């Protein structure tokens, strides 16, 4: 059934400014046409990211009042611990303040310099921590994942042949681990099949290679398996999640995504020796094995939220709400990355703004247009975010020139989705009018965060 | 716009679910076929009432943490007091735990036995407190308000000819006060025009008759004035509200409606001696005049909520979401009260259940049947709620035999409206299947709350 | 063991102004030397009342986030219902917004005009509702209770001989009920023995007379039985509470006292017919049998708080903290009502300010002195609160001319108790310097609430 | 006053309890005789640490409901930023999830391998991040700070002669920065004088050496300046704090101490290029510069808490409550570090356990023994926390072998202090009963957190 009603009601609301177009235009200009510079208080619908922006439940808020704030041995940690062991089925769990804290720990524990880490594409923080610790990254995703127009299921799947080739050519001893991400963010949030997770587990296990999941959107992933993978029709979301992780040696998790919280993450593993070493390192960067840089109340909220995420109707609606936005855009001819993923819709700004060269920052400009026309903030994921080559001074020119409409969980309705869609569709119907942008201030680093622009 | 999106985001959620038809069926019998008697857990979308069921905002919840719980001199009481003085324009305020607490005070303060109270249609608790204190209720609303299907604006208006007649026939001295309600709940949430409020004030003042408003849905009422009364189109909701009350001597208010809270009300008046006497009486029934049977944190929430209610986009969306439900029902040919009111859609039980006489309680029955087929809870607003005539002993017989789909503020989405509209439509297909009801337990007053029936 | 440490720690604090003596003096003067007129924000330690001023737990605050706000059938009501049935052992419970709401219902249900209601002294609201409904009040407390200097246990006990005398002289048919209060507020919060409750139950039952408790401080009462009544040494607080109520036909309860909440109360009874009638009346004044003028979250908080009140260490500390203040004052020779009761210490201002006549308002003036010297607000319970005879224009001259230091539960520490004690002791050491007060503004009614004074 | 009462009221509470001696005994063995390894549920009064264990205020909890959870541009980040700029006077702020997150950034940003970092005594995580990044730690605190029993003011002061010597012997170019901590935790919470901060700034500035403060207990430190440094007696806490930081180039802060929160920290600096580089690095480890691994609601709580910390009566009471505990212990002859510091009383493990050598870990053992006899949890602050010398491999041997009774802010009362003091005193009676400990598990760094021992 295409678009279910919200399987929840509103307990409480977040106050927003409903400032009109003329005032939004002034805010956009004061932000140098960079949506990253906009004030939260000036935004109606904020689709910058689905990270940490989720609406919690009444049950989680009750948990928020029961924070056992002890430095060691907090009841909230034990709740988190037993929840994650039950639901993910790992032996050991170390909390971290969010996903990149867990990635820091994992890559220091699991990588010898010179070794390879192979994955289904990559995410920036994850790959950074791998490389920082001496790894060489190797993309082993299926070639299809790089074709953003290709409508196929389980587009996040690892190519077993590529994995085999890496094993044959570099040797198993020289592969630190396989980093299998669910879903695959860089491909537009594409799911990985259970068949693929099993095949990868089976090949790596034969060579004694470890597999660690980047589990950030593992619940959206489980919903795709439920919906589209033959034989998972009688399985609960919890059963699918538990089976997914049975094919890994551990994971890095951002609770800020699929655990329905505003902060929080953790590291899981099965190996006792690695657990011991991880506990030795968490104290350096995060905090105790029993708080890991989180307040007691946040371990509690994340424990409760991960269990809420198992509800079929919740995750079905989460994914289908994103789908609604994608479908509506596609029906109007708006160019998007296909198929639509679990967490976001990516506009193809290259095609949307065909009259503009990449050097005129079509994605950055389209994101500015969207905020002005609708009060919606979206994220530039194109040439600006790619940054400038420091050696040569040339832009990094990504194949993907996109605007990301990233959907927080349980925050918005289908009517908000219409606001976004109708506005983008209206812009599309006169897309030729969207003006190119030029730098007026460009920092040396992290340019996407603070750069300012004006129209050409 | 016809149907604007929610002018807020979801801050927190609570889970909703439906129990099977057969468990609901047992449940409906268990509750004597009275919807009021089902359990919250057993209801899927709860449209029993917009009273006390509202979603509060983040700001209200911040105020909830700032409860100054002192018996006298609470910062929260000061903030409520100054908010109501600013927004309604009355000299004095006495908080009460809810609206009927205020009606109890007003009726004891302002009625000599044998006097008449004239109002624009009755309300259940209001009339009961009028009658308990020895008043005769006279209905002075226009005839058109009693005609369900008749689509005319400002149906809540007092017929000035009827008021004049009451003055000529009884004498001004025998009229305790005019009870002017905004909106008029039992006519279908129908608004009163500013022109009418001004006319009523002018006529009553000339004769020395006091006017007390039932302020309960005054913001919804102000929305209709802004939308439909010529010359108000560029006035703010707040200006409109402030002008409305300028035509009154005081008011009763259930804050559980338009003040966006879960508990709370108050009594306002301009008269100093009435204020003194009211403080004497409040102590007996409610609490000290400095809290009136409310926690400090609730006086705070109500102060905050009443000001939030003045936001144009909030009340526009509130009223239009109700209108959406009505539009869908009406497009499919489901009989409703017209025009759609501020807070609810009222299915016209007489037309829905042509095959029944009003004596067979079609509304109470329909309410029951909707629960059985859909798990949506709705309320009886016809012959049962009307009560017994305290002179003859016969049922009062309102022309309006209606079943209320009552919308809490900021709780539901258009998708929930769509779920409701689909189920109602389906039930309509087999309307002849709805059976007459008979009393098995009748309470001696306000019988609709806890009466039990059995099928005829 | 004399004074135990707090059997809890501070989860959160309430911000206070620490304004110095000179600024307190200006606030006192702006309040016309009437502590009832002081702003909460200007008070360091507020001992005006133990009603509704309690600090809730983390567990109760979690309950506050789980308010099921449904108009009927709320999960919170069922929680409250089962808690009260378990702990108090009554068959039926109707929630009310606080104690006087329950008293309203009880007196309307249980009294025929002309009938007598006999009790161990009285409280103002309780006795008012009895008389409003046609009852004649008869004090049947032991004569000792009226001797405020007499240090004896179970000073709240009813004199069985007085009860017998009333039965013999007026006839059982003409006694509406016995109103047995635990503790007895007017006597300084004096406990009633289990022996007394049983004797009263046994006598009334033989004559078919009903007994309803005014149960407001029934848990403090149970602690005295535990501490001082032979044979209750192996009994839990819960066992004692449950046995107490086994000697009654029902009760009126203010949760705002011993249920550790800021708002809330309820009516209990065993009789089915009375329960039915009570449900018919609660809708008139309070709300539904399943909310009774409370938000869902408050029924939840009160359910949780009543169960917390059963913890031995909590109630032992509550009562012994009050005792600490009393003991400390008595050791310094400060005149107090004896023995110290469960909830408050009463200063004898007649003796404290011997140089002043009652017409110079010694209690009112002493309460003003206390606030000025310490930042502590206390309540005048003397000639000002007694009011003026409207017939004659003379003061009502009470035998008790007192200042009440009323202790909210779990809000203050022994260090706050020292602030209060040290300041009063310092004032006592030069008590001759305390000046008489004269009216400068006196309202006709409720004079204690708003009257203003100046020094003679 | 010696011991002022709490300058706040209790808003909410959490229950405390003690489990029997024999269950505690099993528990202490279960945790390898390391206090860090017991469970919060099993501790009666938890004095393990003042880090993250503070009670928040009603205002902070109101801010907690107002979490603006946006990835960038959150109102909460803006409020934190402007609060720290106003109160500390630094140009730039980068939030971090807690203090060691900030130390990680500072150490990576400001140290070239082979450089020296000189500080007023070491701290565990600080030294580890210094050393990890290739710095040699040089202790430049006065000798007197290493002498536990020596009662002198401003023990935290840097010995300027030692700083001068470091500059002459190594050269200014080889000193990365001076790490000046306020207060000095491991000397016993000992304050640094303004005179010393000014002297240090003057000497370092002349040589072009940067100074970065560990701001963690800066408010406690400001209290000691106000109380004891001539000429500061009429300065506000805020003026003092602002002046302190005027002598620094930046700071690291764990907000979990003096900012009155349960999570949170930040890095401040004046230098624009260091700020740019820090924003680059924060993204890797913590989060975007606009949240730094914190929920918006926590940036809010920390902004609010830091301003609350400036209230004179709050910090006076905070420090004096610690002092009370120390005074009681000292009056009974229990050996402690003197003078008593801002946040904790440190029992002098060397004198408490004369019969043990430092190699037999007297502090770790005493910590264990106190838990067994009292159920009060305390922390090791001696040879175990000092760690291994990263050149020789031997334990570092601090003269200060101490056991910390660490007081969370606004959680406990003087009665709790009395309970602690009684139990410690009793244990002192039989001090010879405390047995040597030996390692059974030693972590490779920050070993004290999770090391396990067995008795010798
Ligand atoms: C009595 S039925 C349940 C409560 C209900 N209105 C309650 C109203 C009251 C009484 O207010 P309280 O419910 O006591 O706060 C007064 N006037 C008006 C116009 C009302 O609609 C409603 O569902 O519509
Ligand atoms: C590391 S032991 C546990 C945390 C502890 N202090 C932590 C401190 C940190 C690190 O701060 P975080 O714990 O990472 O917020 C820096 N400086 C200073 C002076 C501290 O006392 C304490 O208990 O005292
Ligand atoms: C968001 C994300 C991360 C990092 O988690 P944080 O909690 O943001 O540090 C890692 N991998 C993927 C695929 C992510 O989306
Ligand atoms: C406080 C009190 C009441 C009334 O309860 P409220 O909740 O204040 O209405 C009745 N009896 C006694 C003895 C009380 O103390
Ligand atoms: K967040
Ligand atoms: K409610
Ligand atoms: K209160
Ligand atoms: K904490």
Look at the block and give the residue holding tokens 């681990």: A177
C75-88 vs C296-309: helix crossing angle, rounded to 10: 30
**All residues at 6 or more sequence positions from C24 whose CB lies less than 8 Å from its CB, including other chains:** C42, C371, C372, C375
First to last CA, chain D: 47
A124-132 vs D272-285: helix crossing angle, rounded to 10: 100
- Using the Cβ of C10 and the Cβ atoms of chain A, whether some distance falls under 8 Å is answered with no
- Residue B314: CB within 6 Å of ligand 1? no
Burial call B329-357: b when 16+ CB within 10 Å, e when fewer: bbeeebbbbbbbbbbbbbbbbbebbeebe
Look at the block and give the residue holding tokens 């789980």: C66
> CB neighbours (10 Å) of residue B134?
13
Instruction: Burial-class residue A162 by CB neighbours within 10 Å (0-12, 13-18, 19+).
Output: middle
Sign of the torsion angle spanned by Cα atoms D404, D407, D412, D414: positive
* CB distance C87 to C237 below 8 Å: no
Run of H or E including B385:
helix B383-386
CB-hemisphere CA count at 13 Å for C50? 28
Residue C223: strand pairing partners: none
- Using the Cβ of A173 and the Cβ atoms of chain D, whether some distance falls under 8 Å is answered with no
C272-285 vs B124-132: helix crossing angle, rounded to 10: 100
Instruction: Burial-class residue C224 by CB neighbours within 10 Å (0-12, 13-18, 19+).
Output: buried
- B291 included as an active-site residue: no
Which resolution in angstroms does this entry have? 2.0
* CB distance D296 to D68 below 8 Å: yes
Look at the block and give the residue holding tokens 């000073």: C155
- Using the Cβ of D63 and the Cβ atoms of chain B, whether some distance falls under 8 Å is answered with yes
Q: Which atom of ligand 4 is nearest to the CA of C101?
A: 9
Q: What is the DSSP string of B182-244?
A: SSBGGGTSB---HHHHHHHHHHHHHHT--EEEE-TTHHHHHHHHHHHSTT-TTS-HHHHHHHH
Residue B122, φ and ψ in degrees, nearest 5: -85, 160
Q: Which tokens is C269 given?
A: 């009874």
Cβ contact (<8 Å) for C70 and B40? yes
Going by C-alpha positions, the residue among D271, D124, D247 that lies closest to residue D196 is D247
Q: How was this structure determined?
A: X-ray
**All residues at 6 or more sequence positions from A65 whose CB lies less than 8 Å from its CB, including other chains:** A297, C58, C61, C62, C64, C65
- Using the Cβ of C410 and the Cβ atoms of chain D, whether some distance falls under 8 Å is answered with yes
Q: Which tokens is A455 given?
A: 């129209």
Return the SS3 of A102.
helix
Going by C-alpha positions, the residue among D267, D214, D253, D247 that lies closest to residue D106 is D267
Could you say which of B3, B71, B441, B455 is catalytic? B71
Going by C-alpha positions, the residue among D245, D293, D318 that lies closest to residue D4 is D318
Q: What angle do CA C53, C56, C58 make, to 5 degrees?
A: 160
If you compute the radius of gyration of chain A from its CA atoms, what whole number of angstroms results? Answer: 22
**All residues at 6 or more sequence positions from A168 whose CB lies less than 8 Å from its CB, including other chains:** none
- B413 included as an active-site residue: no
Q: Which atom of ligand 2 is nearest to the CA of D385?
A: 2
Cβ contact (<8 Å) for B286 and C100? yes
Residue D32, φ and ψ in degrees, nearest 5: 60, 30
Which conformational region is residue A269 in: left (phi greater than 0), alpha (psi within -120 to 50 degrees), or beta? beta
Task: State how far the alpha carbon of C125 is from the alpha carbons of B15, B121, C53, C121, in Å.
Answer: 42, 35, 19, 13
Sign of the torsion angle spanned by Cα atoms C344, C350, C352, C356: positive
> CB neighbours (10 Å) of residue B108?
16
Would you state the CATH architecture of domain D58-310? 3-Layer(aba) Sandwich (3.40)
Instruction: Burial-class residue C20 by CB neighbours within 10 Å (0-12, 13-18, 19+).
Output: exposed
Q: What is the DSSP letter of B130?
A: H
* CB distance D290 to D376 below 8 Å: no
Summary count for chain A: helices (H), strands (E): 17, 16
Going by C-alpha positions, the residue among A133, A282, A134 that lies closest to residue D101 is A282
* CB distance A378 to A403 below 8 Å: yes
Look at the block and give the residue holding tokens 């559980």: B256
Q: Which tokens is B337 given?
A: 């009260």
* CB distance C183 to C192 below 8 Å: yes
Q: Which atom of ligand 3 is nearest to the CA of A252?
A: 10
Cα distance between residue D30 and residue D51, in whole Å: 24
C272-285 vs C99-110: helix crossing angle, rounded to 10: 120
Cα distance between residue D104 and residue C221, in whole Å: 58
Percent of residues in chain A assigned helix, strand, coil, to nearest 5: 45, 15, 40
Task: State how far the alpha carbon of D94 is from the alpha carbons of A105, A183, A446, D294, in Å.
Answer: 22, 31, 14, 11
Q: What are the start-end ranges of the E strands in C283-370?
A: 344-348
Run of H or E including B86:
helix B75-88
D21-30 vs D362-374: helix crossing angle, rounded to 10: 150
- D124 included as an active-site residue: yes
Q: Which tokens is C308 given?
A: 């917390």
The nearest CA of chain B is from the CA of A60 a distance in Å of: 9
Could you say which of D35, D83, D96, D124 is catalytic? D124
Nearest CB to C58; choose among A59, A61, A65? A65
Cα distance between residue D436 and residue D361, in whole Å: 6
| Diameter over CA atoms, chain B | 61
CATH number for region D1-57+311-455: 3.90.1150.10
Cα distance between residue D253 and residue A1, in whole Å: 52
Q: What is the DSSP string of D358-407?
A: GGG-HHHHHHHHHHHHH-EE-EEESHHHH-B-TTT-SBP--S--EEEEE-
Q: Which tokens is A297 given?
A: 């109340």
Helix ranges (DSSP H) in B89-137: 99-110, 124-132
Cis peptide before C339 (omega within 30 of 0): yes
Return the domain boundaries, chain C: 1-57+311-455, 58-310
Cα distance between residue C254 and residue C49, in whole Å: 13
Mutational pocket test of ligand 2: of D100, D192, D220, D260, the residue with most ligand atoms within 8 Å of the beta carbon: D100
* CB distance A389 to A380 below 8 Å: no
Cβ contact (<8 Å) for C75 and B263? no
- Residue C185: CB within 6 Å of ligand 4? yes
Q: Which tokens is D92 given?
A: 């730039």
Q: What is the DSSP string of C243-259?
A: HHHHT-SEEEEETTTTT
* CB distance B227 to B189 below 8 Å: no
Cα distance between residue A121 and residue A127, in whole Å: 9
**Interface mutation vs chain D, best among C7, C12, C320, C422, most D CBs within 10 Å:** C12
Going by C-alpha positions, the residue among D435, D432, D385, D397 that lies closest to residue D186 is D385
Q: What is the DSSP string of A373-433?
A: HHSEE-EEESHHHH-B-TTT-PBP--S--EEEEE--TTS--HHHHHHHHHHHHHHHTTGGG
Q: Would you give the distance in Å from CA D189 to the centre of its chain?
A: 7
**All residues at 6 or more sequence positions from C95 whose CB lies less than 8 Å from its CB, including other chains:** C77, C80, C264, C265, C266, C286, C289, C290, C291, C292, C293, C294, C299
- D214 included as an active-site residue: yes
Q: Which tokens is A5 given?
A: 């009603």
| Diameter over CA atoms, chain C | 63
What secondary structure, in 3-state letters, does A229-254 show? Answer: CCCCCCCCHHHHHHHHHHCCCEEEEE
Nearest CB to D15; choose among C18, C45, C57? C57
Return the SS3 of C4.
coil
Going by C-alpha positions, the residue among D24, D34, D25 that lies closest to residue D453 is D34
Q: What is the DSSP string of C194-220?
A: HHHHHHHHHHHHHTT-EEEEE-TTHHH
Find the D420 Cα to ligand 8 centroid distance in Å.
22
Pocket around ligand 2: residues whose beta carbon is below 6 Å from it?
Answer: D 49, 51, 98-100, 123-126, 181, 185, 214, 216, 254, 256, 265
Sign of the torsion angle spanned by Cα atoms C330, C333, C339, C341: negative
Cβ contact (<8 Å) for C283 and B97? no
Cβ contact (<8 Å) for B62 and D58? no
Cα distance between residue C157 and residue B432, in whole Å: 66
Return the SS3 of D138.
strand
Cα distance between residue A40 and residue A377, in whole Å: 9
Q: Which atom of ligand 4 is nearest to the CA of C98?
A: 7
**All residues at 6 or more sequence positions from D148 whose CB lies less than 8 Å from its CB, including other chains:** D188, D335, D336, D337, D338, D346, D348, D350, D351, D399, D400, D402
Residue D93: strand pairing partners: D268
Cα distance between residue D427 and residue B197, in whole Å: 80
Q: How many residues does chain A have?
A: 456
Return the SS3 of A15.
strand
CB-hemisphere CA count at 13 Å for D443? 25
- B448 included as an active-site residue: yes
Cβ contact (<8 Å) for D12 and C7? no
Which residue is closest in CA terms to ligand 1's atom 16? B99
């Amino acid at each position: 059934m295409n678009y279910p009603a919200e399987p929840f009601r509103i307990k409480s609301v977040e106050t927003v400014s409903m400032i009109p177009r003329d005032e939004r235009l002034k805010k956009m200009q004061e932000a140098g046409y960079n949506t990253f510079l906009l004030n939260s208080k000036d935004i109606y619908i904020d689709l910058l990211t689905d990270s940490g922006t989720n609406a919690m439940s009444d049950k989680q808020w009750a948990g928020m009042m029961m924070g056992d704030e002890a430095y060691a041995g907090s009841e909230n940690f034990y709740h988190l611990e037993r929840t994650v062991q039950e639901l993910f089925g790992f032996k050991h769990i170390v909390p971290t303040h969010q996903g990149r804290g867990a990635e820091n720990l994992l890559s220091q524990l699991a990588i010898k310099p010179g070794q390879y880490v192979a994955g289904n594409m990559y995410f920036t923080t994850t790959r950074y921590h791998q490389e920082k610790n001496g790894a060489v990254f190797v993309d082993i995703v299926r070639d299809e994942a790089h074709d953003a127009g290709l409508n196929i299921a389980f587009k996040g799947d690892i190519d077993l042949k590529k994995l085999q080739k890496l094993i044959d050519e570099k040797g198993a001893e020289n592969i630190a681990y396989i980093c299998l991400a669910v879903t695959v963010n860089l491909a537009g949030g594409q799911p990985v099949s259970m068949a693929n997770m099993r095949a990868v587990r089976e090949l790596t296990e034969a060579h004694g290679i470890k597999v660690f999941y980047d589990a950030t959107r593992c619940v959206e992933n489980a919903y795709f398996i439920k919906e589209q993978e033959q034989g998972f029709e009688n399985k609960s979301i919890a059963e699918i999640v538990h089976e997914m992780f049975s094919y890994a040696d551990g994971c890095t998790m951002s609770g800020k995504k699929d655990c329905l919280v505003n902060i929080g993450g953790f590291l899981c593993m099965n190996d006792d020796e690695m657990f011991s070493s991880a506990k030795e390192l968490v104290v350096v960067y995060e905090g105790m094995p029993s708080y890991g840089g989180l307040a007691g109340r946040d371990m509690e909220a994340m424990a409760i939220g991960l269990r809420e995420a198992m509800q079929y109707e919740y995750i079905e609606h989460r994914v289908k709400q994103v789908r609604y936005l994608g479908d509506k855009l596609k029906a109007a001819g708006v160019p998007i990355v296909e198929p639509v993923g679990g967490h976001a819709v990516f506009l193809d700004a290259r095609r949307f703004c065909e009259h503009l060269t990449q050097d005129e920052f079509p994605a950055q400009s389209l994101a500015a247009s969207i905020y002005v026309e609708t009060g919606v903030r979206s994220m530039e994921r194109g040439i600006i975010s790619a940054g400038r080559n420091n050696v040569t001074g040339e832009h990094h020119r990504p194949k993907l020139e996109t605007v990301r409409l990233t959907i927080p969980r349980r925050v918005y309705t289908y009517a908000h989705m219409d606001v976004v869609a109708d506005g983008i569709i209206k812009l599309y119907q006169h897309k030729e009018d969207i003006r190119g942008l030029k730098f007026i201030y460009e920092p040396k680093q992290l340019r996407f965060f603070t750069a300012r622009f004006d129209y050409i």
